[PDB]
Amino acid sequence: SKPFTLPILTLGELTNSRFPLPIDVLYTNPNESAIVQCQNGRCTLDGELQGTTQLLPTGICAFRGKVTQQVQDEHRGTHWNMTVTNLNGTPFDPTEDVPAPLGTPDFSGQIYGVISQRNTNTVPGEGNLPANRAHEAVIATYSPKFTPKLGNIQFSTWETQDVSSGQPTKFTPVGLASVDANSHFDQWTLPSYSGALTLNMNLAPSVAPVFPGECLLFFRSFIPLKGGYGNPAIDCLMPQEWVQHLYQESAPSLSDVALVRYVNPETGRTLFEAKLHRNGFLTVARNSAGPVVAPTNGYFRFDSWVNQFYTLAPM
Amino acid sequence: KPFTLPILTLGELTNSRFPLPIDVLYTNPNESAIVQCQNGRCTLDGELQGTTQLLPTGICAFRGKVTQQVQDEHRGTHWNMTVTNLNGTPFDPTEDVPAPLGTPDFSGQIYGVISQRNTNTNLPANRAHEAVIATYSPKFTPKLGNIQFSTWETQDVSSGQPTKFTPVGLASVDANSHFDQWTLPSYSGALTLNMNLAPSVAPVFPGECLLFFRSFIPLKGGYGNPAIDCLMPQEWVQHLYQESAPSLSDVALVRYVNPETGRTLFEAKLHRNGFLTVARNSAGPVVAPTNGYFRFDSWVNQFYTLAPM
Ligand SMILES: C[C@@H]1O[C@@H](O[C@@H]2[C@@H](O[C@H]3O[C@H](CO)[C@H](O)[C@H](O)[C@H]3O)[C@@H](O)[C@@H](CO)O[C@@H]2O)[C@@H](O)[C@H](O)[C@@H]1O
Ligand SMILES: C[C@@H]1O[C@@H](O[C@@H]2[C@@H](O[C@H]3O[C@H](CO)[C@H](O)[C@H](O)[C@H]3O)[C@@H](O)[C@@H](CO)O[C@@H]2O)[C@@H](O)[C@H](O)[C@@H]1O
């Protein structure tokens, strides 16, 4: 049985699996009322990707496809419909057992980024090269027009004209447009992948502590804002590098819970211990919300597989 | 400890020189430029070199603070920005690196988004705008702790506030935009010599050429299909760093394999300093099945003759 392992990466060497951001801090929120059921950064300890999770850091909250036409929408700005393919360019097959194309955003909000295009057709007078354009864009994942599971979504631009129809289109995520009341940011509310009133399917399961005194431990990143007030954050269950490592290794899970220790490599001392659960998430024995204030060199080290009776030392 | 590569297809790899997926393997034997990129540089035994760091989010990224609006012959509105290390600590120019880790390693107009989250609050004000960084500019001096960027936005950039640059692509590949993926920036400005560089790479055996992992990079406007070629994908850099397997010779013989058929499509030399050569006498993409990946075979020496592609 191939021994289970985690990568040896400090917090400053990790990135978020739910948005293209570095990990900033470890974080807890024991009194969170929402169901925690994110779809990116989901991977079992034996290497099975789940939900909309894929391996590319560049694929997280990215879209690839083609603009079909400019469309009408009551909201401010100029709106565009785009078909979306799989990130590798092959057509998305809605009959596949996934909630949506892999990489699709897994939260409600106004995702800010850049739409870019490189035309298929080339111009002889320009050295047989294609024309290009890029503009800021916003994707409202709560919108009834956000239907990635159906193979198309809508984005808005400040730019009123310079977006071409029928041309290869890329969305590069940068942050959020706003976290105002009317922008509906909620990192734990899933989009309706097939549109309003439809049930999401093939979801990675919800996660939660089962043991008294325990709470979820998150890898937190702060996400940029186009404007307005706020310090929004995105919490993932495991960094993208862990997803990548677990997938590579595919080590058999020898129980439902792996005991891991957060270690200071300088002192060698254990800062705290955590349970790493089979489905791919952490719990700690902590009675407070907020950042885990720990030396920058710290990293999780796999200790052993434990049983249903193991009690964590309080943080 | 045995040397290994990750098991990742081209469609599971990302570029180490710009935040892009790998699109194709690529050769260009007649390239006249010296190849000495500084991102995606890692020895086979796990030593990061040049400006290479581990984060996919750190490649061609900057962190720092805007000092003031400035003037420049380039089009747009210009801003000077001090830069720190990506982890926020002050950049110490006396450290043995060419520039802050993550700094772009090529000449061009790098297009992206500058965003700011104010220090003062009880929530801070924010703003983001499109931005261009001309890495060939005399004002591009990251090794001295500051750079200049331009915006279309004429006013809404705050001085003395934490500032992030998220790269997206290139602004242009016109003649006046000086895109050359193999021309290093002058990290300390005009007239100063770059220091602490990752070494240049080249085949040392006849009949061989460099093999690149190629990504196509977005353009803000204009005509072109620009690409960025890296020596090893970011996942390999991350893997080699993790593993730190001793290099048992100067050349690791690797085979590009079809996992379905089990067949070897071609073989390559993976050199100790972290780059590939193949025996190929043509330029362009390597047309290979999507399931293919490199597998370590054995250590050989520099005189080993590769099977022609
Ligand atoms: C808090 C405030 O957020 C951002 O301002 C936006 C407004 O943005 C518009 O105005 C600003 C200049 O005031 C700038 O020209 C920007 O490009 C433009 O879109 C606007 O969205 C309003 C809508 O109610 O909210 C905010 O005031 C930012 O630009 C400001 O610097 C500041 O951080
Ligand atoms: C090839 C061409 O590239 C891009 O156009 C730019 C020009 O951009 C300006 O005009 C376009 C619409 O023509 C758009 O309004 C854009 O926002 C604006 O900056 C301009 O920079 C010229 C220089 O004279 O270079 C390019 O032609 C692109 O926007 C076009 O769609 C088209 O692909």
- CATH code of A289's domain: 2.40.510.10
Separation CA B199–CA B181 (nearest Å): 16
* Co-location of B140 and B285 in the same domain: no
Instruction: State which of A177, A201, A225 marks the end of a domain.
Output: A177
> Chain B closest CA to A116's CA: distance in Å?
6
CB contact under 8 A, B113 and A8: no
B57 chain-A contacts, CB cut-off 8 A:
15, 20-22, 57
* Co-location of B251 and B164 in the same domain: no
Secondary structure, 3-state, chain B: CCCCCCCCCHHHCECCCCCCECCEEEECCCCCCCECCCCCCECCCCCECCCCCCCHHHCCCEEEEEEEEECCCCCCEEEEEEECCCCCCCCCCCCCCCCCCCCCCCECEEEEEEEEECCCCCCCEEEEEEEEEECCCCCCEHHHCEEEEEECCCCCCCCCCEEEEEEEEECCCCHHHCCECCCCCCCCCCCCCCCCCCCCECCCCCCCEEEEEEEECCECEEECCCEEEECCCHHHHHHHHHHCCCCCCCEEEEEEECCCCCCEEEEEEEECCCEEEECCCCCEEECCCCCCEEEEEEEECCCCCCCCC
Instruction: State which of B171, B199, B229 marks the end of a domain.
Output: B171
Q: Which atom of ligand 1 is nearest to the CA of B155?
A: 15
Question: Are the beta carbons of A218 and A36 closer than 8 angstroms?
Answer: no
- Assign residue A78 the CATH number of its domain: 2.40.30.120
* Co-location of A240 and A313 in the same domain: yes
Q: Distances from the Cα of A68 to the Cαs of A153, A312, B180, in angstroms?
A: 10, 54, 34
* Co-location of B101 and B80 in the same domain: yes
φ/ψ (deg, to 5) at B143: -65, -25
* Co-location of B145 and B198 in the same domain: no
**Structural domain that includes position A91:** 60-177
Tokens 């995606």 map to which residue?
B40
CA torsion B1→B7→B11→B17, rounded to 10°? Answer: 0
* Co-location of A193 and A301 in the same domain: yes
Judged by DSSP in three states, A178 sits in coil
Which H or E run contains A247?
Answer: helix A240-249
Residue B26: strand pairing partners: B212, B285
Q: Say if ligand 2 is within 6 A of residue A123 CB.
A: no
Give which of B101, B113, B152, B174 to mutate to test A binding, by max A Cβ within 10 Å: B113
* Co-location of A162 and A212 in the same domain: no
The number of distinct structural domains making up chain A is 2
> Chain A closest CA to B56's CA: distance in Å?
7
CB contact under 8 A, A13 and B86: no
* Co-location of B182 and B307 in the same domain: yes
Report resolution in angstroms: 1.8
From first CA to last CA, the distance across chain A in angstroms is 32
Which H or E run contains A187?
Answer: none
Q: Distances from the Cα of A250 to the Cαs of A1, A199, B99, in angstroms?
A: 10, 31, 38
Approach to solving: X-ray
A153: CA distance to ligand 1 center in Å?
26
CB contact under 8 A, A132 and B6: no
Q: Say if ligand 1 is within 6 A of residue B124 CB.
A: no
Q: Say if ligand 1 is within 6 A of residue B195 CB.
A: no
Question: Are the beta carbons of A153 and A173 closer than 8 angstroms?
Answer: no
* Co-location of A198 and A312 in the same domain: yes
